[PDB]
């Protein structure tokens, strides 16, 4: 690798045949500075605090995606149509801060070693899917060109809570349920 | 079976010593294999694997392409450092430090930024190295880290256990005391 005090990705351009779909983000020291909503054609911030560190003009990202789609078709033929290897992701679930009964917390589900970047991350409360209070990062890049993604669930800790993070991925024979143990 | 074909382009800026050393590396990647690269220290494109030889030769033969990528060291890396990264590098989030028992003592150091931290355990003002288990640094993804440091404990009466946390945001290290 390259030794350096700080690394920025300006940007991470992802484009995949499946979908097809693209993703445009800038990263700094491994965290997501901003993304571009490719459908609305608008720069956006998962973490709005970081919008005070400059905007971004989105047409450059959309031009990149057009070229990325073009380049991908070329590389698929260069590599005689060799599809992506489905890696086995690695899932871990933890809380943002120490758990205190009745004090709002955040459950964090880290899905690491993701490739290809095609994944379903869902939260289960007492074995049932939960949509309220859920958010997630973009596919965040790694120097081995795999990805990780993190999902969040805000919740009020209780004595008989039952939470799982459920991950579906072609690298898994069956959906992986990772139980949260306080 | 379902399958995917992935193209990635990474415009990566490496900074050392503030702005003293700046290095642009653009990477062209099929699936997980980087096949072509521009490295500003080299100054021309290189084929990382055979499948990138067409593109290196094609790009290196066009003066306008070469000048355009070389310029990005200034117009992207040095530019975004002044616009964004200088300020981001001044951002400080002070860690929350808490001790809770479970014998084992658990020092939770949560919600801090940036990542550089040192968590030490003391018993009666003496540093404890043995029986200490520290997690790796934990990236929360929301621009904070956490780290958990457990200490194996056999308390005598009158014992004071201190968790000692040094972090760039702190004027002086945070000490949290615990006694049975």
């Amino acid at each position: 690798d390259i030794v350096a005090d700080h690394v920025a990705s300006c940007g991470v351009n992802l484009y995949q045949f499946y979908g097809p779909s693209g993703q445009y983000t800038h990263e700094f020291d491994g965290d997501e500075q901003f993304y571009v909503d490719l459908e609305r054609k608008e720069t956006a911030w998962r973490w709005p605090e970081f919008s005070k560190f400059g905007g971004f003009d989105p047409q450059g990202a959309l031009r990149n995606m057009a070229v990325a789609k073009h380049n991908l078709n070329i590389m698929i033929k260069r590599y005689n149509s060799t599809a992506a290897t489905n890696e086995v992701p690695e899932v871990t679930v933890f809380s943002k801060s120490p758990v205190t009964l009745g004090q709002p917390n955040t459950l964090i589900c880290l899905v690491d070693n993701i490739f290809p970047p095609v994944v379903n991350i869902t939260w289960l409360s007492n074995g049932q899917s939960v949509t309220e209070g859920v958010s997630e990062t973009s596919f965040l890049s790694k120097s081995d060109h795999s990805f990780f993604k993190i999902s969040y669930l805000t919740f009020l800790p209780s004595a008989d809570e039952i939470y799982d993070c459920k991950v579906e991925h072609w690298g898994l024979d069956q959906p992986l349920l990772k139980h949260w143990e306080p | 079976s379902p399958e995917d074909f992935v193209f990635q382009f990474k415009g990566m800026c490496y900074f050392t010593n503030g702005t003293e050393r700046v290095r642009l590396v653009t990477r062209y990647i099929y699936n997980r294999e980087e096949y072509a690269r521009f490295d500003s220290d080299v100054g021309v494109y290189r084929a990382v694997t055979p499948q990138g030889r067409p593109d290196a030769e094609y790009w290196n033969s066009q003066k306008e392409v070469l000048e355009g990528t070389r310029a990005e060291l200034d117009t992207v890396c040095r530019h975004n450092y002044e616009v964004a990264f200088r300020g981001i590098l001044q951002r400080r989030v002070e860690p929350t430090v808490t001790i809770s028992p479970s014998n084992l003592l658990v020092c939770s150091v949560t919600d801090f930024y940036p990542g550089q931290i040192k968590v030490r355990w003391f018993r009666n003002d003496q540093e404890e190295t043995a029986g200490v288990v520290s997690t790796p640094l934990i990236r929360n993804g929301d621009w904070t880290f956490q780290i958990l440091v457990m200490l194996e404990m056999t308390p005598q009466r009158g014992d004071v256990y201190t968790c000692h946390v040094e972090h760039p945001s702190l004027q002086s290290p945070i000490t949290v005391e615990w006694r049975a």
Partner: peptide, 13 residues
Amino acid sequence: AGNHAAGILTLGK
């Protein structure tokens, strides 16, 4: 006050 970004080139061959 805008961030800039590296451009993706179209390939050869």
